[PDB]
Amino acid sequence: STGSATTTPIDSLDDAYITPVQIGTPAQTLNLDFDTGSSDLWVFSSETTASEVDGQTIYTPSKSTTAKLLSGATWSISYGDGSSSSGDVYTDTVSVGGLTVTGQAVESAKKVSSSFTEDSTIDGLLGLAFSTLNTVSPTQQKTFFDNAKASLDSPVFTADLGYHAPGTYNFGFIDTTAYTGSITYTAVSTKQGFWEWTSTGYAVGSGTFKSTSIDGIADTGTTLLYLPATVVSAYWAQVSGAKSSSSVGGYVFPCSATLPSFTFGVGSARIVIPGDYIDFGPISTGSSSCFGGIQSSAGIGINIFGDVALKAAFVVFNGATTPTLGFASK
Numbered sequence: 001s002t003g004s005a006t007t008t009p010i011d012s013l014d015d016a017y018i019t020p021v022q023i024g025t026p027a028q029t030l031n032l033d034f035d036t037g038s039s040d041l042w043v044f045s046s047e048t049t050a051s052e053v054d055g056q057t058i059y060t061p062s063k064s065t066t067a068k069l070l071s072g073a074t075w076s077i078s079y080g081d082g083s084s085s086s087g088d089v090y091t092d093t094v095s096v097g098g099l100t101v102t103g104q105a106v107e108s109a110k111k112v113s114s115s116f117t118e119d120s121t122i123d124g125l126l127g128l129a130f131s132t133l134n135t136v137s138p139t140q141q142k143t144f145f146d147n148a149k150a151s152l153d154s155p156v157f158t159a160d161l162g163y164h165a166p167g168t169y170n171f172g173f174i175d176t177t178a179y180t181g182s183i184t185y186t187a188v189s190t191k192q193g194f195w196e197w198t199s200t201g202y203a204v205g206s207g208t209f210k211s212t213s214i215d216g217i218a219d220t221g222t223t224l225l226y227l228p229a230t231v232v233s234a235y236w237a238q239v240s241g242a243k244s245s246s247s248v249g250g251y252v253f254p255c256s257a258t259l260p261s262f263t264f265g266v267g268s269a270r271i272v273i274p275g276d277y278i279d280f281g282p283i284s285t286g287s288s289s290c291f292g293g294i295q296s297s298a299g300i301g302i303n304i305f306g307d308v309a310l311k312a313a314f315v316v317f318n319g320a321t322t323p324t325l326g327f328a329s330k
Helices: 144-151 229-236
Strands: 003-009 017-023 028-035 041-043 068-078 084-096 099-112 124-127 156-160 167-171 180-187 196-204 210-218 225-227 243-245 250-254 262-266 269-273 279-282 289-292 294-296 303-305 314-318 324-329
Touching (some): 003 084, 028 041, 068 099, 099 144, 180 196, 196 229, 210 225, 229 250, 229 294, 250 294, 269 324
Parallel strands (some): 028 124, 041 099, 225 294
Antiparallel strands (some): 003 017, 003 167, 041 124, 068 084, 084 099, 156 167, 156 314, 180 324, 196 210, 196 262, 225 303, 243 250, 262 269, 279 289, 314 324
């Protein structure tokens, strides 16, 4: 089997992407944030604290004939940005772009932090990291991808994120028309539960390529590109007036700038992020100071190839016995 779903930016900055997901019988369609950096599928629901819901579409398990309470199971998760959610667990039928899993753990939020409440366009998350990170207790649950794998034509999913435009998540097949040139595959470590790999270096604008190993994760659930302070300083030094601002929380630059591109290595291949992708607009409405899309990972504890990097590529998440990552230009 296969699945194919369109994923859409939630706003004009591509702060995140939502993909329609059918849950239960009859289908309840919720727009979820597909997150290759976590492994819980959780949703706003009929059980969510009423004051913490503001515009989201909710899953109501009592209206689904295939929903079953997973007796005794709870979940609680915290993300790298400090947001969080928690609740109990149902199993139900979950379909993505024509691909159906029965008995999927659907984690029902009783509590969500303010940033989720304030995000009216995101009805939940669908984790696509490795199932070892799943927070369900006392019995850990599998991701949608892990549940689907055996039925898939090929044990893969692909992320094809758009820049200010819709894109595509495919399950079980590689759309050879969706990218240019070849796909370069690179090794993955699952030791921390992430799609963790090692980039072979970088370049800034038309600069020469610096060969250097950069360990990081492919994370569709993170907006920006977080890299070592040395790399990030080298990038922003090429933008007149750019500076790191503690008060804002990162590198800012004059909105009048033209940003250079940023290239990262995948083995011998190169992915080029256009400078435009790195502009996240005014720090506050009306400001002439703009927020940078490449930021320091120092104090995160890990480098993150978030959407800024991934949307510049066609990305293959290969979940074979030995997982790997593939990157192609597009």
